Write an enzyme that holds these catalytic residues in place. Structure first.
Site, PDB file in Angstrom:
ATOM      1  N   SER A   1      30.379 -67.230   7.138  1.00  0.00           N
ATOM      2  CA  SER A   1      29.827 -68.581   7.262  1.00  0.00           C
ATOM      3  C   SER A   1      30.677 -69.644   6.562  1.00  0.00           C
ATOM      4  CB  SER A   1      28.396 -68.646   6.717  1.00  0.00           C
ATOM      5  OG  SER A   1      27.510 -67.854   7.486  1.00  0.00           O
TER       6      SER A   1
ATOM      7  N   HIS B   1      30.143 -65.468  14.925  1.00  0.00           N
ATOM      8  CA  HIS B   1      29.187 -65.864  13.901  1.00  0.00           C
ATOM      9  C   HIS B   1      27.750 -65.860  14.426  1.00  0.00           C
ATOM     10  CE1 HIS B   1      27.199 -69.071  11.333  1.00  0.00           C
ATOM     11  NE2 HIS B   1      27.550 -68.150  10.452  1.00  0.00           N
TER      12      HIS B   1
ATOM     13  N   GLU C   1      28.459 -67.744  17.887  1.00  0.00           N
ATOM     14  CA  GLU C   1      29.551 -68.712  17.853  1.00  0.00           C
ATOM     15  C   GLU C   1      30.914 -68.030  17.798  1.00  0.00           C
ATOM     16  OE1 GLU C   1      27.666 -70.847  14.563  1.00  0.00           O
ATOM     17  OE2 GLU C   1      27.637 -72.641  15.834  1.00  0.00           O
TER      18      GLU C   1
ATOM     19  N   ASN D   1      25.776 -75.357  12.110  1.00  0.00           N
ATOM     20  CA  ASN D   1      25.755 -75.864  10.742  1.00  0.00           C
ATOM     21  C   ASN D   1      26.361 -77.263  10.663  1.00  0.00           C
ATOM     22  OD1 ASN D   1      24.560 -73.452  10.035  1.00  0.00           O
ATOM     23  ND2 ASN D   1      26.438 -72.541   9.203  1.00  0.00           N
TER      24      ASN D   1
HETATM   25  N1  LIG Z   1      23.016 -64.285   5.543  1.00  0.00           N
HETATM   26  C1  LIG Z   1      23.057 -65.131   6.568  1.00  0.00           C
HETATM   27  O1  LIG Z   1      22.080 -65.750   6.987  1.00  0.00           O
HETATM   28  C2  LIG Z   1      24.299 -65.251   7.185  1.00  0.00           C
HETATM   29  C3  LIG Z   1      24.440 -66.076   8.296  1.00  0.00           C
HETATM   30  C4  LIG Z   1      25.636 -66.104   9.005  1.00  0.00           C
HETATM   31  C5  LIG Z   1      26.710 -65.325   8.586  1.00  0.00           C
HETATM   32  N2  LIG Z   1      26.583 -64.514   7.451  1.00  0.00           N
HETATM   33  C6  LIG Z   1      27.762 -63.780   6.937  1.00  0.00           C
HETATM   34  O2  LIG Z   1      27.611 -62.350   6.962  1.00  0.00           O
HETATM   35  C7  LIG Z   1      28.195 -61.828   5.755  1.00  0.00           C
HETATM   36  C8  LIG Z   1      27.054 -61.565   4.771  1.00  0.00           C
HETATM   37  O3  LIG Z   1      26.093 -60.700   5.383  1.00  0.00           O
HETATM   38  P1  LIG Z   1      24.539 -60.807   4.974  1.00  0.00           P
HETATM   39  O4  LIG Z   1      24.416 -61.809   3.892  1.00  0.00           O
HETATM   40  O5  LIG Z   1      23.739 -60.991   6.206  1.00  0.00           O
HETATM   41  O6  LIG Z   1      24.241 -59.345   4.372  1.00  0.00           O
HETATM   42  P2  LIG Z   1      24.401 -59.079   2.793  1.00  0.00           P
HETATM   43  O7  LIG Z   1      25.423 -60.012   2.269  1.00  0.00           O
HETATM   44  O8  LIG Z   1      23.048 -59.084   2.193  1.00  0.00           O
HETATM   45  O9  LIG Z   1      24.993 -57.581   2.747  1.00  0.00           O
HETATM   46  C9  LIG Z   1      26.384 -57.347   2.506  1.00  0.00           C
HETATM   47  C10 LIG Z   1      26.765 -55.965   3.042  1.00  0.00           C
HETATM   48  O10 LIG Z   1      28.128 -55.685   2.668  1.00  0.00           O
HETATM   49  C11 LIG Z   1      28.089 -54.546   1.792  1.00  0.00           C
HETATM   50  N3  LIG Z   1      29.236 -54.474   0.860  1.00  0.00           N
HETATM   51  C12 LIG Z   1      29.226 -54.814  -0.425  1.00  0.00           C
HETATM   52  N4  LIG Z   1      30.462 -54.664  -0.893  1.00  0.00           N
HETATM   53  C13 LIG Z   1      31.232 -54.224   0.099  1.00  0.00           C
HETATM   54  C14 LIG Z   1      32.514 -53.870   0.123  1.00  0.00           C
HETATM   55  N5  LIG Z   1      33.175 -53.965  -1.027  1.00  0.00           N
HETATM   56  N6  LIG Z   1      33.095 -53.384   1.229  1.00  0.00           N
HETATM   57  C15 LIG Z   1      32.326 -53.246   2.389  1.00  0.00           C
HETATM   58  N7  LIG Z   1      30.981 -53.631   2.331  1.00  0.00           N
HETATM   59  C16 LIG Z   1      30.473 -54.108   1.187  1.00  0.00           C
HETATM   60  C17 LIG Z   1      26.753 -54.684   1.088  1.00  0.00           C
HETATM   61  O11 LIG Z   1      26.408 -53.428   0.488  1.00  0.00           O
HETATM   62  C18 LIG Z   1      25.929 -54.904   2.342  1.00  0.00           C
HETATM   63  O12 LIG Z   1      25.929 -53.706   3.130  1.00  0.00           O
HETATM   64  C19 LIG Z   1      29.038 -62.971   5.215  1.00  0.00           C
HETATM   65  O13 LIG Z   1      30.236 -63.120   5.991  1.00  0.00           O
HETATM   66  C20 LIG Z   1      28.093 -64.123   5.495  1.00  0.00           C
HETATM   67  O14 LIG Z   1      28.794 -65.375   5.446  1.00  0.00           O
HETATM   68  C21 LIG Z   1      25.367 -64.470   6.759  1.00  0.00           C
END
Ligand SMILES: NC(=O)c1ccc[n+]([C@@H]2O[C@H](COP(=O)([O-])OP(=O)(O)OC[C@H]3O[C@@H](n4cnc5c(N)ncnc54)[C@H](O)[C@@H]3O)[C@@H](O)[C@H]2O)c1
Ligand SMILES: NC(=O)c1ccc[n+]([C@@H]2O[C@H](COP(=O)([O-])OP(=O)(O)OC[C@H]3O[C@@H](n4cnc5c(N)ncnc54)[C@H](O)[C@@H]3O)[C@@H](O)[C@H]2O)c1
Lengths: 283, 283
Positions: free
Chosen positions: A122, A143, A155, A194
């Site tokens: 994001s 995205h 996206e 966004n």
């Molecule tokens: N949260 C949202 O609403 C939202 C929206 C759009 C995009 N994103 C994007 O998605 C990603 C975040 O995902 P999320 O917040 O939905 O889930 P999250 O951040 O809660 O989970 C993260 C995942 O990555 C894992 N992880 C941790 N360390 C790691 C590593 N070193 N190597 C590989 N995996 C690892 C965590 O254990 C978990 O499985 C980011 O790029 C964020 O910008 C999130």
């Protein structure tokens, strides 16, 4: 031809799990990657929860179809094995520059030449990451939005280096998993959604913080003026006030003044929005 | 007590006529003021048109009620006579500083002490005008939206000088004529609605002009992302592209770049939006 069939999702958090599940639900061969067996156990819990949500909320998920998608998902904590035959890798690891930097360094090496990489990031631009991938022609952003089954936009945003054919393949993949492809032509921080929403929520916050009008007045003005179903503050509650706080705290001075307002009047009182059942409004 | 009964509207243009008619329709004694007999003739044409619209679109207007409101309206081109027994004067003259300056100079003198003044001005703050009125305690803004019968918000915004009791009387008046009172607590350029909408439309324009995405993509993203019925560009067409052009041309550099884009791609081709049946979309 060949097309995308094997998809690996890196990270099984809130969005990682939704992406992997939506993709498995649409018939692709999904591998869910995470760092260790405990993370994979948690991932499995998220999938079981998602299967339950789908069976109640998603067309075609009833009568075991979602449970069958659940059962077909492969789990791996070995990156090399996880991407060994991957056509597409969707990266949804924590929003950490160095953590993502580390991943794409390895991923670029371990993944076969064919593999397309897509970040769900994001806040980080694909151009901030394209270097660590080693395959800029096969790197782009895909995205998603939280609750992918209902907010089903995807996206698509590449770099100047992205291969036009890769881009179109990701667009077709997105449609194949039941998403609406939102096609960007050039990189833009915040993609489309966004980019549109933040300015609206900022303007609402400014009106509030400068004491121009209360939340209720601001919201009804937006609903009546544009026919929108929800006003800015209803939207804040949905976004979650903790999240709004974090984002505003690292923004301009007017927004930072809003963050303090959130912190004092809502966060410190346990009123975090829709999640806790009360934010700007009580639910 | 006394309450508002006699209302004079200054100006019988697009909004002046809607304000006077909505007010007459709700039983107030309305005088419509304009500069000469030809202007008053045109005003009468607008009222006849509005009566027709109401009888088709507005609850309670059928079976002659709107025609009766039409018949009760008084016409005057003599400012002194027009406001001689006015409880409320609503100013809807052209958006010209000197023209409004001239009016309030005279109005303050000719109107009895009791008379409340309200400007419908979109771009001039009441503080820019309060001086010329001579009665700052009885001066405030009451800002309507085009098509008052459907977009029935009435933004109430005074100065630090405005009398709290006057403000509340205008709020009650607004409800009495079937409007939703939008109560501002402090002056703000653009009131509430424009303050919210412009940033959204600016962000959309930026995405377009910088070639990030096309109108259709931007619009569907907004509808899907927020559940809104219309996207920014559908909104532009409704606003009218001539209007959007004018506003953008006197804004920041990114918006001025949009103005040129509008001028070249739409205005110069006769595609002015909903009015001509084609703008960003074809209708
Ligand atoms: N949260 C949202 O609403 C939202 C929206 C759009 C995009 N994103 C994007 O998605 C990603 C975040 O995902 P999320 O917040 O939905 O889930 P999250 O951040 O809660 O989970 C993260 C995942 O990555 C894992 N992880 C941790 N360390 C790691 C590593 N070193 N190597 C590989 N995996 C690892 C965590 O254990 C978990 O499985 C980011 O790029 C964020 O910008 C999130
Ligand atoms: N047009 C809108 O959508 C809109 C929206 C909100 C507020 N307003 C505000 O309402 C006013 C403009 O009204 P409008 O654009 O709906 O109608 P208009 O501007 O088309 O008509 C102006 C009226 O004032 C009359 N007039 C001209 N010179 C005058 C004078 N010297 N003294 C008295 N009257 C004079 C004109 O003949 C006409 O009757 C401005 O304050 C504008 O900011 C307009």
């Amino acid at each position: 031809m060949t097309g995308i069939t094997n998809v690996t999702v890196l990270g099984t958090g809130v969005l990682g799990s939704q992406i992997a599940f939506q993709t498995a639900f649409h018939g692709f061969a999904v591998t869910a990657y995470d760092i260790n067996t405990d993370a994979l156990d948690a991932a499995k819990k998220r999938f079981e929860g998602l299967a339950a949500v789908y069976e109640k909320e998603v067309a075609g998920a009833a009568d075991g179809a979602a449970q069958k998608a659940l059962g077909g998902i492969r789990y791996s904590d070995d990156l090399a094995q996880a991407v060994k035959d991957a056509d597409l890798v969707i990266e949804a690891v924590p929003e950490s520059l160095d953590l993502k930097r580390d991943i794409y360094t390895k991923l670029g090496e371990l993944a076969p030449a064919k593999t397309i990489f897509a970040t769900n990031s994001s806040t980080l631009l694909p151009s901030d990451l394209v270097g660590y991938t080693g395959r800029g022609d096969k790197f782009l952003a895909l995205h998603f939005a939280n609750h992918v089954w209902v907010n089903n936009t995807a996206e698509v945003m590449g770099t100047t280096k992205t291969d036009p054919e890769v881009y179109q393949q990701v667009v077709e993949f997105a449609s194949a998993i039941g998403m609406v492809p939102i096609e960007l032509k050039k990189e833009k921080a915040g993609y489309v959604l966004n980019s549109l929403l933040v300015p609206l929520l900022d303007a609402a916050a400014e009106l509030l913080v400068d004491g121009i009008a209360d939340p209720e007045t601001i919201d009804k003005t937006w609903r009546i003026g544009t026919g929108a179903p929800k006003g800015p503050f209803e939207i804040f509650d949905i976004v979650g006030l903790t999240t709004a706080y974090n984002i505003s705290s690292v923004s301009g001075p007017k927004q930072r003044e809003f963050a303090a307002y959130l912190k004092e009047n809502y966060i410190d009182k346990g009123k975090l929005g829709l999640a806790t059942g009360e934010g700007f409004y009580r639910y």
